Amino acid sequence: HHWGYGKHNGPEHWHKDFPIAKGERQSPVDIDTHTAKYDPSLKPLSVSYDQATSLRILNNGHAFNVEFDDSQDKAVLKGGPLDGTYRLIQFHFHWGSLDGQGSEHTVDKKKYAAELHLVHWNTKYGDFGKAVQQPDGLAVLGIFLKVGSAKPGLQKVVDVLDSIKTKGKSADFTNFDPRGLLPESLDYWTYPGSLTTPPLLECVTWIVLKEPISVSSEQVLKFRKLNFNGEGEPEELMVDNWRPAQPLKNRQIKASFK
Ligand SMILES: NS(=O)(=O)c1ccc(NC(=O)Nc2c(F)c(F)c(F)c(F)c2F)cc1
């Protein structure tokens, strides 16, 4: 009886195994655009993905991760609220069963169809496992998805999903360029938070872009054909794998723009 997104093991249950679920800096949160304050001291945000080396795509039973070679400084995030260099290790998404839900963060209580998370770790801690134990260990770049026009740079991801339908399946996934998943603007909100799944560690500087990307109805429909279950187990569609907004508590969300 392990954690997931169902009635009996979903977000309302997680606190029993992971008491930090009710902690002081949990994610996601609602971003109240009127209460977020412009911070003129936020330096420019630097996304350097030209040397990114993707390796593999994995269905982990909660989402699918596109994994990168993070054994050298190849694809890094710097600037913004960050001190130092953060290496891209993987990206994944959270999405809904319907176009009106699926994102983890919300904007003035608005839910988007999905949310992309580009996960990076602070190189001063040497490896990802040490980084998650630090309050400034991770930086996750969050990007909202709305349904409209297709995102051409997403299609290579969509087309390999048939090969990783069930929990535990992986496929080679080399030469994928994550630059094709970014919107035009890097305007963002930022706040200190956590992983949005167990173990819910409070190790993340969240950087959430204001501008969503558009994906097609057909692209998101293909996400919804994935399975939470393993092969040969009863089929449960991988949909609604998002945690709802958590209390902001003693935090301020800062904006990079006005
Ligand atoms: N949705 S998210 O906040 O971007 C997120 C990112 C990474 C992870 N976790 C991992 O990618 N690996 C992971 C981990 F960090 C841990 F801290 C663990 F204990 C663990 F078992 C992991 F697999 C969970 C949610």
Ligand SMILES: [Zn+2]
């Ligand atoms: Zn995530």
